Design a protein around this ligand. Structure first.
Ligand code: 3KK
Ligand code: 3KK
Ligand code: 3KK
Ligand code: 3KK
Ligand code: TPW
Ligand code: TPW
Ligand code: TPW
Ligand code: MG
Ligand code: MG
Ligand code: MG
Ligand code: MG
Ligand code: MG
Lengths: 572, 574, 572
């Protein structure tokens, strides 16, 4: 070891921790680190808006399991990340944001961009610190990295900033400890056999067990989950954050039976999943028959809203496998599961077939379902959807996408936070992580306007993305809530903008589609010329399931009207 | 068959159902609705003279019993009087619940009586700090906060809940009162991964001088799996103030008078439920120059701080210790380093303990405080069983003398890593009410005692059989010493020759003064037979504790003590 | 100038800012400052509990107008001040708390007493900072001092901490600027003549104008206030924080007519006073006839709860004088004022006379009013109450004191915060500020137990205080609310403690009184042998006005039942 500046040690820490790319937007306050990363051969993915850098890191970590890194300058560089940080905090995604900040001598004197970054981010981070001791910077980075995994909290974003004078200070070689530089393995807490046995007992007693998966299940490869489904005879639901773990053809996979599974299950088993608004707060109003069991590697997925008759705090894979083993010699009763599955096959197959022929709305424009029809028709022709990363974003478009996207290797979307604008940044992070296939993002026009200039970033860094815009000249789920519940549409219309032209202005391939029969051809050309955008002129006369269920209205007790009605009855 | 009842009734029931049989507090209007309901269910109310003392009593209760304890305080100054005791619990990572009063929702921000931002003041030193504005969700919020106090979504420590008085009085329909939120919950038991267990056993097989240092998380076990691992590993053993009492004094590993020698030479430091904070030299290579590091804990607050393990086990510590012991089944440890320390320890500790009975008066003619520990040792097996006694220490010099003078105790409590002066009397009261059969003896500096002296009243009114012994040296003496030695000017560190026995008698406790060291055993004997009691010992200012000699008072740049700091300064210049 | 350590410059800053005493409790982290203060001859008033030091500083500033200073060590030294800081923040009293904290190199490493002091205090301070730049420490002190006066906020407490390594760092002489060292005058914003004229117009139109005073009025000597009372014919009420500004014999002074003034005034003029719970939130329910005008040097006494038809933001003295001048040639209609005054003379005189002969309660013990009777009887004999600083504290005792203490040079009490325990610390700060007269504090036994050991501090520093304890073996306003509203008394009884014995154990003169006829003699002996305590064995059978009006109950909308009833009617 030799005496080297803090900036050098930070670049080395990152590379040794397995960071081969940093997302960011340059400023003077972070230039010392930016320079050292480039000199070590860490790829710098520079963006048009720092928020997008943090979104890219989110997508990288969620897909790969490797903690990802954004770097931004002081002041507006940091404040531009708050949305993307909050989004990662809600989704419990490990990531590190490195911020610039003013030299220590000028503290509180009104130097350029002295604002309280750590106080702004503290509520939505696992850690937010200013590092004022050159010798301790390495230690602070390693500890923050561990806290991003969930140590002393739960998985999510961490923020570190180093005053520019400290970045330039040398650290003597004695104080540069290998144990802080090196990569660390993930923790693997194991289940207690008595909890495993108690869950197996509940499964044996249940007639309609159901497993709902989430983030923590999606950190596994799905095989231990499938073992437990086979051993238990449980029905299976996933969530936006846990798609892709169980084959569609599995006798448990009943994705078109969400309401029926929740209404009738007598044993809800959550696997790395919150009982947040997406699952009716786990309310007895939404699960009127269910006993509850919770399995997770974080109490953020054990204690919220409902408590388990058993709760297992362990690596979910190990817990699923242990419970499967414990059900050695059990003959599951699968008759409810099988009855749902027979209905599911009809419902899901009729729905997927109908995507190819959805009528234009009353305004003469494409129904957005035809986008998902066209993608389905191209499967096995010009792309393999089973190898493809799919992304959805928007309001009505997002709700249609949840039903229209049925084969994907991986799925990302606006998340429980409802974070519009993720589509393009996510696509870029996904595409640079998995350079072999195009990544396909389908987005509302409203959501796309937030991050459209990142098309430039995809072109400059050669991220092979296809963006498909549902261009309905509107914030349409908003416009619909305005008409139905208020009788006045105001400030929710957009214009017939040329998003293909925006894409072409930033060097991407672009095409506009007004005729639904042109979709397959346009998506074929976009895939062969990624990065590319397909601007689809879509109808305003198409209510998504989210629209129909009052998501826009914000009821008192539940996100959706039917759940809220059930909660009002429970409360009497 | 549940009925519609007020939030205040549901809170009292939640607490009782979670195993709460006592609440420490001080009444105010904002919390009276809960206070009343606790009394009507038969939960004992231990009312104090200062809310901070209530939170100290809860801390002592949880630390000793493992049962999360509860303090209840009114809005405004009731809540703000808890901040020190909350911070203390936060540093020590002790689960506890503080329930605060606060103004009715309609008056928010309007200058109602005692509207201050309690949650913002406490957020930095709690695992959770919330105002509960939805009557039907109060039970849920209590149960989740209780789990966060155990360490869920954070690490063990204090949580804060406050319920606006209008919410306390609102009815909750019976369908919304869920059994799953009312019922007591078992502690979590994450288990070790066998590959980590194997990797630690491999490091132990390869070490020549393994050493285990225990802390809080070890002290949550009964010590028997720790002993199994000591036996299988041949490791030397050190404890810390927060982990006394787990290993028999005569165990071949127990080498408490060889602290420097263990740290200087160990080639494998194993932390068990212990932080590498200032009390262990930040785990610095300057203080552990030969050590590989392994960390075992049920919380990463005792795995990632300052040093990283070659292996880190995140599990219930008992299970991890037992697993590693099993893995060493056929290992024959090399115990020659441990045994050589142990032989020197036996003599050093025995000579130290013997000399306590005869320590000379200082140049000012007053008792050396070590004679307090001599007297207690002399009474062991006569009028008290030290092995069954909860010992407490507090102060500056007195506390440092206590760390060597208190060697036999069932359990030990003190000022903590936070250096929280004034814990002695509140801790003794919580300890005595938890263990009413048992001797409870607290030894304190005069300076520390003045912070919570009026709690003697609480001990008398609630019949807490405590003995407080005051090292009355008319000074904040570790401070006075640092002033003289490093600054050449003693100012604002002298106190007076106060009659602390008279203070105790004024509050209906037994009290006696001792000026002659030969009177100490008799005065402590009379105090034990007449508890609650105070013994006011007139002690010397001419007596430097180890803490005093090592520069604790000076606050060096890198380490709490001069010798460690010198070692760190050398490390920084390689 | 020469190169000197930060610790030296801090001691010099304080002395040059007019600080001749610092209240505190020693620790290693602040020893460098403590030492330098002593070497410059600043008196160190060392206490038994840091909270008491901050209370002492509060009392000094409230009485003298000089910003006062407490100094405490890291960790529990700082956390022991939070109550006294909150109290000063509620009362808007300028003061500076200097805290110790760990050296910068050990930040976040678990050094001794590293807790987030600034985050704990930020919500109840005008400023809370860690000072990490030796050269900028002086500047930070001067700016914080200004913010304690109300610059960039409103008057109140500020907190500064200096890491011990920074305290020991030298500052070159160039960077030690005279402008930061020197004392600064208070600000004196002036009224706008059009606002002055608009208030005079409202007074001319009013038939029952009333002035209520507060903190900002009490920063004046009362003479401009009396000029405006004379010019306006207004009735006058003060509050606990504004006693002593208007002679008792003034035709406006109607202190026994509080309810009548609020019910019937058609023009409420607040002068440096909040419309907080102490004035019924200024609700139309409590002031049903009143137009509102607000005068203050801080918007903290202009915008809360009621807005003025006119609001004057100015030095209150100047504003009162300007409005008096503007009422040149007005003949006030004083008939309502005079009618209140005639009733007030009877009510207040009967009340004061009855204090001398109040019967023992049913339990055979002294009614606490006899304490105020005895003090009244000694006036002009062994003390001059008109030159005496009176302090009250407790529950029932505090409410009796508000009526029983009618002549004092100055009055302090538990404040709008209801801060039990202030009595002894306040008495000590008052006595060291005004060494010529004994200071008299009357306290409940409950409140006294919080700070009783400060009797030691009064003895060691020779603060000539007399403490009189209403020893009713109870938190009695609490016990009464328990009996009346709940039918169960539990955890509100105390014991028949020997507080005289506690005082004597700390070297003070002490005496116990069981016979009300012994009060004058005991108080005479206490005054001649201060510091002294008189332990009065008092009745539990005595409801204070606060007790009778439901203060203990905490109604939904107002602090007191009758105000709350009026608010409930207003809300229908
Ligand atoms: C750090 C990084 C890169 O990551 C960032 O985030 S930078 C953020 C984006 N940039 C900014 O926000 C700008 C920040 N800096 C400034 O605001 C300015 O540099 C300053 C206020 C600190 C200094 O500005 P000046 O006081 O130098 O003002 P200017 O108006 O820029 O004048 C420059 C020169 O032109 C002169 N000048 C002005 N008007 C002129 C005129 N009309 N004709 C000729 N000369 C003219 C002026 O006198 C002066 O010359 P001199 O007297 O120093 O030689
Ligand atoms: C409030 C506002 C407007 O300002 C916002 O900010 S909104 C923010 C942007 N939007 C979001 O972030 C979305 C938030 N909402 C949601 O995530 C969802 O509404 C929910 C998670 C709360 C509830 O979703 P569901 O549990 O209904 O799940 P979906 O996958 O949407 O399925 C809807 C229906 O289609 C069904 N379905 C699923 N896949 C199918 C398939 N392949 N074929 C046929 N039907 C299928 C499914 O069973 C169900 O029907 P049913 O069982 O209720 O009858
Ligand atoms: C800064 C200020 C003044 O403002 C404050 O606020 S201070 C706050 C109040 N004080 C505290 O909270 C104490 C803080 N400090 C400590 O906790 C300790 O100094 C330390 C943890 C940092 C260091 O303690 P040690 O590791 O030195 O442990 P001790 O138990 O005190 O042992 C001291 C010595 O006695 C030895 N010893 C222990 N038990 C013995 C026995 N039974 N017989 C003989 N010797 C014995 C022990 O080995 C050692 O000698 P050596 O090996 O260094 O020579
Ligand atoms: C909630 C709990 C118990 O947990 C707490 O924490 S309480 C905290 C400790 N207590 C406090 O901090 C006190 C808080 N409350 C108050 O400050 C007062 O209740 C108040 C400011 C809200 C209202 O006080 P008032 O405006 O009633 O003022 P007082 O000076 O108390 O006067 C009471 C009555 O005596 C009258 N009075 C005043 N001086 C008199 C005199 N000299 N002779 C005769 N009568 C006199 C006065 O006019 C009035 O009678 P009326 O006009 O209403 O009929
Ligand atoms: C940053 C932000 N601001 C507003 C909103 C609120 C919202 C959620 S969905 C929606 C309409 C989306 O319009 P889009 O054109 O993308 O989709 P479509 O319905 O198919 O026309 C809005 C305004 C959110 N969640 N995020
Ligand atoms: C609340 C608080 N304020 C100050 C301090 C700083 C301190 C730590 S030790 C000490 C002196 C203790 O004097 P004592 O009389 O108890 O013991 P002895 O040395 O034997 O005479 C001080 C002032 C701490 N830690 N906490
Ligand atoms: C730190 C704090 N904790 C509790 C309370 C709540 C309270 C306000 S008044 C009172 C009773 C006071 O008893 P005392 O004996 O002093 O007076 P008396 O009624 O005449 O017997 C309590 C408990 C407050 N405000 N502050
Ligand atoms: Mg933005
Ligand atoms: Mg749209
Ligand atoms: Mg002492
Ligand atoms: Mg206190
Ligand atoms: Mg009382």
């Amino acid at each position: 070891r030799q005496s080297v500046p803090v900036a050098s040690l930070v670049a080395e820490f990152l590379q040794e921790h397995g960071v081969d790319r940093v997302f960011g937007l340059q400023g003077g306050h972070i230039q010392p680190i930016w320079d050292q990363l480039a000199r070590r051969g860490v790829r710098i993915v520079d963006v048009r808006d720092e928020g997008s850098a943090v979104h890219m890191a989110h997508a990288h970590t969620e897909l790969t399991g490797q903690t990802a890194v954004a770097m931004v300058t002081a002041g507006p560089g940091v404040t531009n990340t708050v949305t993307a940080v909050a989004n990662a905090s809600v989704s419990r995604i490990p990531l590190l944001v490195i911020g610039g900040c003013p030299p220590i001598p000028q503290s509180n004197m009104g130097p350029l961009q002295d604002i309280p970054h750590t106080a702004i981010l503290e509520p939505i981070t696992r850690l937010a610190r200013t590092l004022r001791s050159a010798d301790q910077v390495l230690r602070e980075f390693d500890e923050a990295w561990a806290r991003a995994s969930g140590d002393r909290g739960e998985p999510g974003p961490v923020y570190l900033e180093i005053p520019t004078d400290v970045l330039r200070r040398d650290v003597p070689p004695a104080l540069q400890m290998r144990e802080h530089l090196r990569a660390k393995p993930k923790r693997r807490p194991q289940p207690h056999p008595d909890d495993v046995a108690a869950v197996a007992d509940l499964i044996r007693a249940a007639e309609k067990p159901a497993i709902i998966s989430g983030r923590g299940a999606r950190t596994t490869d799905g095989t231990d989950l499938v073992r437990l489904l086979d051993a238990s005879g449980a029905a299976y639901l996933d969530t936006q954050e846990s798609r892709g773990l169980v084959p569609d053809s599995h006798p448990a996979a009943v994705g078109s039976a969400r309401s029926a599974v929740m209404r009738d299950t007598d044993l809800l088993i959550t696997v790395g999943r919150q009982l947040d608004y997406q699952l009716g707060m786990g309310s007895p109003a939404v699960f009127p028959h269910a006993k509850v069991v919770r399995i997770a590697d974080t109490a953020s997925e054990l204690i919220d809203n409902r408590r388990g008759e058993v709760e297992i705090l362990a690596e979910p894979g190990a817990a699923l496998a242990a419970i499967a083993d414990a059900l050695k010699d059990h003959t599951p009763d699968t008759s409810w599961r099988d009855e749902l599955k027979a209905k599911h096959r009809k419902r899901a197959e009729d729905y997927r077939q109908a995507l190819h022929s959805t009528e234009n709305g009353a305004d003469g424009h494409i129904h957005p379902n035809r986008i998902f029809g066209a993608l389905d028709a191209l499967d096995g022709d010009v792309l393999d959807l089973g190898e493809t990363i799919m992304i959805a974003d928007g309001g009505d478009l997002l709700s249609f996408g949840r039903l229209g996207i049925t084969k994907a290797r991986r799925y990302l979307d606006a998340g429980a936070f409802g974070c519009l604008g993720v589509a393009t940044p996510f696509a870029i992070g996904a595409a640079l992580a998995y350079p072999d296939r195009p990544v396909v993002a389908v987005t509302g026009d409203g959501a796309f306007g937030i991050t459209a200039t990142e098309i430039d970033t995809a072109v400059r860094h050669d991220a092979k993305i296809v963006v498909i815009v549902s261009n309905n000249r509107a914030w349409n789920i908003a416009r619909y809530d305005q008409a139905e519940n208020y009788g006045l549409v105001v400030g929710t219309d957009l214009a017939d903008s040329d998003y293909a032209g925006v894409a072409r202005a930033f060097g991407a391939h672009g095409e506009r589609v007004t005729d639904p029969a042109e979709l397959e051809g346009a998506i074929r050309r976009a895939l062969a010329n990624a990065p590319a955008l397909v601007d689809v002129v879509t109808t305003q006369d198409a209510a998504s399931p989210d629209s129909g269920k009052g998501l826009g209205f914000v009821p008192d007790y539940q996100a959706l009207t039917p759940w809220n009605d059930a909660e009002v009855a429970r409360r009497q």
